[PDB]
Amino acid sequence: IHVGHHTLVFELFGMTFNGDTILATAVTAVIVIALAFYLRAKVTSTGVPSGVQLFWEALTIQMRQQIEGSIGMKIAPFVLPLSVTIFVFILISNWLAVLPLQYGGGAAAELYKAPASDINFVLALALFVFVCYHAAGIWRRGIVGHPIKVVKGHVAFLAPINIVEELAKPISLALRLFGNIFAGGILVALIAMFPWYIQWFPNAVWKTFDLFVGLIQAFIFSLLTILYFSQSME
Amino acid sequence: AEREAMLAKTAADNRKSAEQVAAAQADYEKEMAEARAQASALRDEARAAGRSVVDEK
């Protein structure tokens, strides 16, 4: 099925970059930036909200409710922007794959492959969240206090387990997002092996459900980010 | 914050408009009854002055 082989690969600063993944991430970023700018231009406190205003309001309200119910908004004002940007980034990345941006070589190529299908994207998001809430814990507990609480956790005599669970927080949070989208990239490829007259059915059903799967994955990734922040700050 | 303040105003106005209509009615009635009481006191003072003048004369 020809897994891997990122296209547009180049080399700079003595390291290799997957061009296609960067292009997909840039496309998602520009879509999110366009949504943000269209909100900013058309954000009304007194008027009737636009569609983008309603979308952003619902997302922000959901994340703010999560923060309130897990760790006070006073303690964690900086985590709401993180949750909102994470959710929109992953949601748009996954949903842009629903567009028919794939063709035949004679293997199947795809103009836009979901960036989460690449290990670098999901690993970058997971490690950024990891560093972010570990820094938040350090700030709220101290440079030396925070590691002690992290190792101790809620049960002291389970110290190694915590040290594993902690290292499991990023890894899973990355791979859980990786395999879910990576797997999809294979199915669409696998379904491409069918002839056109029967390819549309499995492809149609798979991508119709992949809309919901990507929505749920973005929601889960953001929710677990908020939960890890609430855990690591107190 | 806008939605919040809008809710707040919808709340106050309705309240304050209701309470102010009630207060306007109550204050009109109070002032009118105070005027009636002053008029009655003035008429009673006139009655007392009349009784005093008739008795003295």
From Swiss-Prot, chain B:
Subcellular location, record wording: Cell membrane
Family the UniProt entry places it in: Belongs to the ATPase B chain family.
Stated role: F(1)F(0) ATP synthase produces ATP from ADP in the presence of a proton or sodium gradient. F-type ATPases consist of two structural domains, F(1) containing the extramembraneous catalytic core and F(0) containing the membrane proton channel, linked together by a central stalk and a peripheral stalk. During catalysis, ATP synthesis in the catalytic domain of F(1) is coupled via a rotary mechanism of the central stalk subunits to proton translocation.
Subunit structure: F-type ATPases have 2 components, F(1) - the catalytic core - and F(0) - the membrane proton channel. F(1) has five subunits: alpha(3), beta(3), gamma(1), delta(1), epsilon(1). F(0) has three main subunits: a(1), b(2) and c(10-14). The alpha and beta chains form an alternating ring which encloses part of the gamma chain. F(1) is attached to F(0) by a central stalk formed by the gamma and epsilon chains, while a peripheral stalk is formed by the delta and b chains.
Protein's name according to its UniProt entry: ATP synthase subunit b
Gene that specifies this protein: atpF
Parent-protein start and end of this portion: 58 to 114 of 170
